[PDB]
Amino acid sequence: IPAFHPGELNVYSAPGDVADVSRALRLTGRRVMLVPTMGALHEGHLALVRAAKRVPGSVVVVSIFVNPMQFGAGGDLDAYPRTPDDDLAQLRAEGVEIAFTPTTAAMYPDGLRTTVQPGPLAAELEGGPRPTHFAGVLTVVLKLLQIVRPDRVFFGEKDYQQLVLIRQLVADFNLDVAVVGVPTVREADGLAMSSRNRYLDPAQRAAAVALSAALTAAAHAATAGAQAALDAARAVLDAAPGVAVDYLELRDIGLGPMPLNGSGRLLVAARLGTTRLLDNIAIEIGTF
Amino acid sequence: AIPAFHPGELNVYSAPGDVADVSRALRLTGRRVMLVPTMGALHEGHLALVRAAKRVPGSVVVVSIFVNPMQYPRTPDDDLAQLRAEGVEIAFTPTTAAMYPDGLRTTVQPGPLAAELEGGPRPTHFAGVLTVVLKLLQIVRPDRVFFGEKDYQQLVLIRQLVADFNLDVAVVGVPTVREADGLAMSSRNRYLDPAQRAAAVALSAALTAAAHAATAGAQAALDAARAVLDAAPGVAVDYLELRDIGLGPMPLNGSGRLLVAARLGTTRLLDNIAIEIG
Ligand SMILES: CC(C)[C@@H](N)C(=O)NS(=O)(=O)OC[C@H]1O[C@@H](n2cnc3c(N)ncnc32)[C@H](O)[C@@H]1O
Numbered sequence: 001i002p003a004f005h006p007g008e009l010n011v012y013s014a015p016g017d018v019a020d021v022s023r024a025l026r027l028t029g030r031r032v033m034l035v036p037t038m039g040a041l042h043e044g045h046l047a048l049v050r051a052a053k054r055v056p057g058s059v060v061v062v063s064i065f066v067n068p069m070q071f072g073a074g075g076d077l078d079a080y081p082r083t084p085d086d087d088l089a090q091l092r093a094e095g096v097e098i099a100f101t102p103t104t105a106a107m108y109p110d111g112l113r114t115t116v117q118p119g120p121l122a123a124e125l126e127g128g129p130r131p132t133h134f135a136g137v138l139t140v141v142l143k144l145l146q147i148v149r150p151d152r153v154f155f156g157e158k159d160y161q162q163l164v165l166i167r168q169l170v171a172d173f174n175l176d177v178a179v180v181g182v183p184t185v186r187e188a189d190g191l192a193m194s195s196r197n198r199y200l201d202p203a204q205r206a207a208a209v210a211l212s213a214a215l216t217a218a219a220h221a222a223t224a225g226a227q228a229a230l231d232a233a234r235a236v237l238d239a240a241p242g243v244a245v246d247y248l249e250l251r252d253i254g255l256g257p258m259p260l261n262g263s264g265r266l267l268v269a270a271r272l273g274t275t276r277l278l279d280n281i282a283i284e285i286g287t288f
Numbered sequence: 289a290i291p292a293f294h295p296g297e298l299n300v301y302s303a304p305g306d307v308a309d310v311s312r313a314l315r316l317t318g319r320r321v322m323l324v325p326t327m328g329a330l331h332e333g334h335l336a337l338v339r340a341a342k343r344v345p346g347s348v349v350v351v352s353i354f355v356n357p358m359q360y361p362r363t364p365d366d367d368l369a370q371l372r373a374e375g376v377e378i379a380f381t382p383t384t385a386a387m388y389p390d391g392l393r394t395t396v397q398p399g400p401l402a403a404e405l406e407g408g409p410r411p412t413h414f415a416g417v418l419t420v421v422l423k424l425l426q427i428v429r430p431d432r433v434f435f436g437e438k439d440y441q442q443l444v445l446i447r448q449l450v451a452d453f454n455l456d457v458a459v460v461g462v463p464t465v466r467e468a469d470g471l472a473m474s475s476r477n478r479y480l481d482p483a484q485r486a487a488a489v490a491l492s493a494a495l496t497a498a499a500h501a502a503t504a505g506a507q508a509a510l511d512a513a514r515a516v517l518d519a520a521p522g523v524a525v526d527y528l529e530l531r532d533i534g535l536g537p538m539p540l541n542g543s544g545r546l547l548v549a550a551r552l553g554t555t556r557l558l559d560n561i562a563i564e565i566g
């Protein structure tokens with residue numbers, strides 16, 4: 001096997017390497033935590049890291065890979081922020097012991113051959129205009145799960161539809177891994193932290209508070225029912241300078257069609273100039 | 289707590305979590321878990337897979353029996369009896385509802401080979417096969433998984449699954465078991481009337497002739513097989529194709545595979561054979 005130095009950051013590029021190291025560690029009793037990322041790490045990613053780190057006797061594997069398969073059209077791929085130096089320094093600071101940084105050739109030696117076909121949820125919301133996006137995501141996440149074989153895998157609630165689809169993947173293929181959702185990390189004014197936030201100028205940055213404002217307003221209005229919750233969110237988004245709403249939708253927590261008046265998730269996607277922002281929140285209908 | 293396991297006896301589990309728990313406990317005790325996926329109605333062709341799995345030192349054999357609705361009689365008690373007689377220690381016999389508790393939701397989409405040959409008449413067949421095999425691999429987590437060369441295209445697509453999804457299992461293909469005259473063993477053979485069963489020998493005869501004709505090249509191999517099939521009455525050839533061993537285009541020399549499918553009345557038969565060109 002390759003070398004592993006405990007209490008140090010170990011960086012592996014080869015899938016076989018991180019696989020052997022993970023397998024070895026699992027036999028020594030350490031529980032293996034996996035945090036899949038596309039790099040450009042910020043505080044939101046670090047909350048997943050810290051959630052992983054908190055599991056007693058955990059070894060934390062953070063993968064960094066920009067997956068060509070989940071990008072669909074033009075140059076979303078070439079436009080994705082890549083800050084690899086900073087990424088490894090943050091992981092060192094967090095006391096993460098393993099970074100997995102595979103090449104495209106190592107992940108896709110045969111191009112797109114066998115792939116994962118998600119359920120119908122992948123055609124909705126984010127999947128609407130990007131009908132192959134989630135197939136890309138679930139395919140890469142399945143591969144990472146098989147390479148690393150973790151006990152638990154960590155995803156943010158910020159990408160709630162992704163989190164849900166990953167739960168379906170784990171259930172539907174009988175994967176032996178626990179999926180842990182981690183609450184969204186927000187700036188001081190409520191803005192959901194995202195790498196995309198850097199594409200916002202100072203005007204747009206100011207208008208952007210509206211997504212989380214609309215959602216939290218909705219969450220409190222919801223004592224008055226679903227229509228009140230939705231109308232409150234919409235009013236806030238309409239009061240906001242140059243925020244173009246793509247969707248604002250209230251669903252059950254599994255992203256089915258809402259109960260009558262139960263527990264749910266309110267999701268929004270909006271454009272500020274060229275920058276598409278996402279946010280979501282837990283909603284309880286008729287409950288203070 | 290781990291379900292009861294009695295060594296040297298046939299232990300039957302219907303719940304995925306149960307066989308998962310048992311397989312995990314056994315590997316920890318120094319056993320090597322071998323998986324043999326079947327749809328039951330076992331014959332000597334299936335038992336060859338079993339015997340291959342058994343001879344691995346330290347092996348514990350898991351035979352799954354599950355009829356996939358995603359990819360016609362049944363004998364549960366007789367199947368279990370055969371496994372008992374082979375000395376298999378675990379049979380996994382789940383229900384459709386246990387395997388598919390949420391219906392068909394996430395599935396495996398095979399590569400383009402799935403659209404070819406057997407995927408011609410049945411264009412969603414291999415999607416069903418790869419999905420269920422992926423599920424059984426995750427449930428049992430075997431060290432090795434066994435498939436017959438009889439279903440060569442199936443075997444090749446399973447190797448593609450294992451490669452593409454980085455699965456940590458060895459895929460072992462087991463030679464086709466044949467009747468005394470060379471007909472590949474299949475439950476479908478019993479449906480053949482005496483004339484059809486006589487004519488059916490032409491598939492295997494055609495392929496072995498080709499394998500021997502191939503010292504004279506690719507075209508001589510193909511022409512030999514076609515002549516043999518042309519000498520049989522009531523044999524409707526669906527395809528006869530020579531490909532490389534991974535089922536790509538045949539290279540000019542080197543190793544190949546010759547595959548045939550044909551219909552004798554209502555019964556469809558398949559066969560294939562290794563070929564070495566020149
Ligand atoms: C690799 C695969 C999972 C890919 N589709 C992906 O989402 N890559 S990612 O780098 O954009 O994000 C990695 C993880 O960080 C999570 N994340 C991002 N921002 C936040 C935040 N503000 N609060 C909490 N969690 C967050 C995000 O939901 C995801 O689970």
Ligand SMILES: CC(C)[C@@H](N)C(=O)NS(=O)(=O)OC[C@H]1O[C@@H](n2cnc3c(N)ncnc32)[C@H](O)[C@@H]1O
Nearest residue numbers: 325326327328333334435436438439463464465473
């Ligand atoms: C579950 C999945 C594998 C499913 N598609 C399937 O094939 N079920 S099956 O019961 O019909 O086949 C079980 C296994 O037995 C193998 N098999 C059958 N006949 C023979 C034979 N004559 N010689 C060698 N091997 C043989 C067959 O190729 C397969 O790997």
